[PDB]
């Protein structure tokens, strides 16, 4: 799994400069989300359950991993494997997080960034979500953000957590990528 591997094409929404963050709409197909859930399901171990796929371990996931390299412009040598969660030498510093929603969550369950410069307000945001910048889980969407400033210093605005789900069932996959080859 090196370099960059027909490209992905969807909608990009800029969310913030602190942390620098983008929403990628329909980054995963519905078919890809359902695959990842079912492939992960029998591996899930204990809140949330989870499992880990090594970079390049799975053929369908590997296609997606290439897509992440392409959109981030960072070669696959720098990437970790894939963490899947269900809610109920090393490459140097981590620089970018990609969080992919495998299911749509009707109410609550937002990713929240409480130290972001923005807070969400009003209709359709849970009370937890209103503590910072938040993103609704929609199947196929991906939240991309940088944990370092351009000069390589820490961006504390990139701290994130999961709001409790009030209506629905939240599955997510998280890809971390480093400044250098692992």
Interacting span for Cl ion (CB under 5 A) from 7-15, 64-72, 114-122, 161-169: 161-169
Half-sphere exposure of 20 (CA within 13 A, CB side): 10
Q: How far is the CB of 99 from Cl ion (least distance, A)?
A: 6
Indicate whether 126 belongs to the interface with Cl ion (CB under 5 A): no
Ranges of beta strands (E only) in 18-127 are 20-24, 49-53, 79-86, 94-101, 107-108, 111-113
Q: Does 162 bind Cl ion (CB under 5 A)?
A: yes
Q: Which residues neighbour 115 within 8 Å (Cβ) at sequence distance 6 or greater?
A: 132, 156, 157, 158, 159
Smallest distance from the beta carbon of 7 to Cl ion, in angstroms?
Answer: 26
Q: Which of residues 92-121 bind Cl ion (CB under 5 A)?
A: 111
- How many CA atoms, within 13 angstroms, populate the side-chain half-sphere of residue 131? 18
Residue the block writes with tokens 């809610």: 87
24 vs 76 by CB, closer to Cl ion:
24
- The answer to the question of residue 147 lying near Cl ion (CB under 5 A) is no
Residue closer to Cl ion by CB (options 69, 109) is 109
Contact positions toward Cl ion, by CB under 5 A? Answer: 111, 162
């Amino acid at each position: 799994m090196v370099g960059f591997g027909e490209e992905w094409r969807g909608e990009v929404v800029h969310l913030s400069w602190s942390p620098r963050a983008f929403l990628l709409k329909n980054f995963l197909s519905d078919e890809e989300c359902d695959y990842i859930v079912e492939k992960a399901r029998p591996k899930m171990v204990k809140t949330s359950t989870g499992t880990w796929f090594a970079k390049g371990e799975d053929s369908v996931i590997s296609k997606i991993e290439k897509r992440v390299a392409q959109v981030t412009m960072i070669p696959l040598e720098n990437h970790e494997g894939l963490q899947v969660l269900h809610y109920h030498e090393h490459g140097g510093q981590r620089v970018v997080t990609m969080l992919m929603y495998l299911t749509t969550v009707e109410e609550g369950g937002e990713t929240v960034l409480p130290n972001a410069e923005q807070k969400v307000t009003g209709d359709g945001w849970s009370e937890c979500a209103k503590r910072g910048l938040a993103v609704k889980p929609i199947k196929g969407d991906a939240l991309m953000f940088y944990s370092l400033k351009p000069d390589g210093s820490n961006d504390p605005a990139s701290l994130h957590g999961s709001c409790p789900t009030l209506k629905g069932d939240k599955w997510s996959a998280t890809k971390w990528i480093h400044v250098a080859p692992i």
